[PDB]
Amino acid sequence: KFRRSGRLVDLTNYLLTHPHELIPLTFFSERYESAKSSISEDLTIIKQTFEQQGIGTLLTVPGAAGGVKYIPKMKQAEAEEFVQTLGQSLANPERILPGGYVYLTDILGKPSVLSKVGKLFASVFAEREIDVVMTVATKGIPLAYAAASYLNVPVVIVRKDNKVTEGSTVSINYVSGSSNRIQTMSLAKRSMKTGSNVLIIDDFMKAGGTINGMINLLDEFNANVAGIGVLVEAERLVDEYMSLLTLSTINMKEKSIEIQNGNFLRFFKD
Amino acid sequence: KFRRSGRLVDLTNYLLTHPHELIPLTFFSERYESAKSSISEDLTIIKQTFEQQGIGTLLTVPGAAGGVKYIPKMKQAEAEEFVQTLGQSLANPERILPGGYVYLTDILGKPSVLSKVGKLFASVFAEREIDVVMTVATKGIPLAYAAASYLNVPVVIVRKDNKVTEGSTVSINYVSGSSNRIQTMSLAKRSMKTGSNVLIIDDFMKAGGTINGMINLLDEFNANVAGIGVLVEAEGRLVDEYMSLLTLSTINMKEKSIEIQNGNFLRFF
Ligand SMILES: Nc1nc2c(ncn2[C@@H]2O[C@H](COP(=O)(O)OP(=O)(O)O)[C@@H](OP(=O)(O)OP(=O)(O)O)[C@H]2O)c(=O)[nH]1
Ligand SMILES: Nc1nc2c(ncn2[C@@H]2O[C@H](COP(=O)(O)OP(=O)(O)O)[C@@H](OP(=O)(O)OP(=O)(O)O)[C@H]2O)c(=O)[nH]1
């Protein structure tokens, strides 16, 4: 069957792979052929270790329709050290592109980096009620999936083309600050339940025209924005958002990227 | 310092979050302030439990240059049952779209499905030399990042635009079987090192002209095809060796009927 040593390894792996799911104690008890009191002490050790190591926390919801829920969390210390390292790598002037753009797609591709950004996002929005994570194609998509895996919620991708083949669609128009052109963004009607609570994730925000377009698109679904998370904000039509980094405009002459913290610390108060 | 119980929990978490990394036994000795004799006892328990529970294999390589490595693996039974499960739910007649297309957007969006498809891909290609996972925007991107996270390699996204502003780009042309139009797919030059071993991941293959486009694009970088993996292949093929989970028989738009069976994935077990 299972001795205690293996039971803890399996318990640890089951929790880590089912974050934000409520598991009844009888599930573990029947699985390891052990008493619910022995399971509860194993969950006490996992709890203390998760907290000490900065992995997360275990919530116990009481009652027969209760159980345990693993919640990924990030300590403020690991958060600002990681954001500091991130900003230092984004500071590289080799990333400067024509038009004052910054090359970040190597960073959005590394697995270690994405899992920590996704964990950070999930840590900050852990206690909101999120049905779905939403972003717009294309570069926001890795971030959206990292965050959604820790939160255990589907991802919805807003498309800027009505090229697509995925059934009936709803589109709106929005003004970016860029092309002050009116671009269009769209979403399949069958890809989001109406009334859902949406966490919006995106790679980058300047004055927020794209995110505000996502907000108005949610109105057409009678959905609610549970939160807004952005990796980089430029130095604003939007409301409350969390940002990891702040980018001061690229001085294209001096070849200089200057980046500081975002407002993320505001969300780590003891 | 940790007692044995907290050490097992931390050790499990650390291994699960650092797959395919050779970790020296001395890293854990300094970490936990304990002998390599005690840590080797814990690795032995984790190894047995990872293997019994279908989580993966814990490979111990001796020597100073060696250590411990966690390799995500899927057992055949779990692969058979998950693929059958996925196959039936995709054979839902509501998924049929105008033009004979099949709506996958919801499946490719759920986190628990993606982690098992990603783990399946990573289990089959676990022993191959891979520097990077590559896919085409947009729907392949979830599968590619799922598989890459288990393999611990970066992800590279081929754009069917050339619009994109990420520096100097290499573009090629290719013919779909669809629009027998010649479309264009591009790849930034600073997003791929010369001679990279590339695992191609996509959501759907019919004739293979998109995947064949990606292979042609890899030669402009003198990169190699480490492997090709697709969620769904259509019946009836310019491509070489690939792995598929599902096969889709053309939607009889008259009958309202999607017919789907297993792919070729069993031949890798
Ligand atoms: N320097 C830099 N900019 C980025 C990066 N990623 C996105 N941007 C830009 O930020 C802006 C996104 O903000 P939006 O949500 O579109 O809101 P906005 O219309 O008010 O600008 C876009 O620039 P834009 O305002 O839409 O037009 P433009 O300034 O490029 O001419 C987008 O091109 C990056 O990595 N580095
Ligand atoms: N039924 C269905 N088909 C999909 C779906 N997603 C992509 N396809 C089709 O699969 C094909 C992509 O495979 P390719 O790699 O391009 O293979 P190919 O060039 O030899 O045709 C495209 O059609 P095509 O092979 O170029 O021609 P056609 O069969 O669409 O007429 C594409 O339209 C889907 O979700 N459902």
Author numbering:
A (entry chain A): 2 to 236, 241 to 275
B (entry chain B): 2 to 237, 241 to 273
The authors write:
PurR is a transcription regulator in bacteria with the major role of repressing the transcription of genes responsible for de novo synthesis of IMP, the common precursor to the purine nucleotides ATP and GTP. B. subtilis PurR comprises two domains, an N-terminal winged helix-turn-helix domain for DNA binding and a C-terminal effector binding domain. In contrast to E. coli PurR whose effector binding domain binds purine bases and is structurally similar to a ribose binding protein, the Firmicute PurR effector binding domain is similar to the phosphoribosyltransferase (PRT) class of enzymes. However, the PRT domain on PurR lacks enzymatic activity and serves a purely regulatory role by binding PRPP to de-repress transcription.
We next solved a co-structure of ppGpp bound to B. subtilis PurR to 2.45 Å resolution. In the structure of the B. subtilis PurR-ppGpp complex, ppGpp binds to the PRT domain in a pocket defined by three loops found in all PRT proteins (II, III, IV; loop numbering from PRT enzymes). The guanine ring of ppGpp is engaged in π-stacking interactions, sandwiched between the aromatic side chains of residues Phe205 and Tyr102. The 5′-phosphates of ppGpp nestle into a pocket formed by loop III and an α-helix, where the backbone amides of loop III and the side chain of Thr211 coordinate the 5′-phosphates. The 3′-phosphates extend upward and out of the binding pocket, where they interact with backbone amides of loop II and the side chains of Tyr102 and Lys207. While (p)ppGpp is commonly co-crystallized with divalent cations (e.g. Mg2+ or Mn2+), we did not find evidence for metals in our structure. A loop that bridges the monomer-monomer interface of a PurR dimer is unresolved in apo PurR but is resolved in ppGpp-bound PurR, suggesting that ppGpp binding stabilizes the conformation of this loop. The effect of this change is that ppGpp significantly alters the electrostatics of the effector binding domain by creating a positively charged channel different from the apo protein. The ppGpp binding site partially overlaps the PRPP binding site, as seen in an overlay of ppGpp and the PRPP analog, cPRPP, bound to PurR. PurR Tyr102 is flipped away from the pocket with PRPP bound and covers the guanine ring with ppGpp bound.
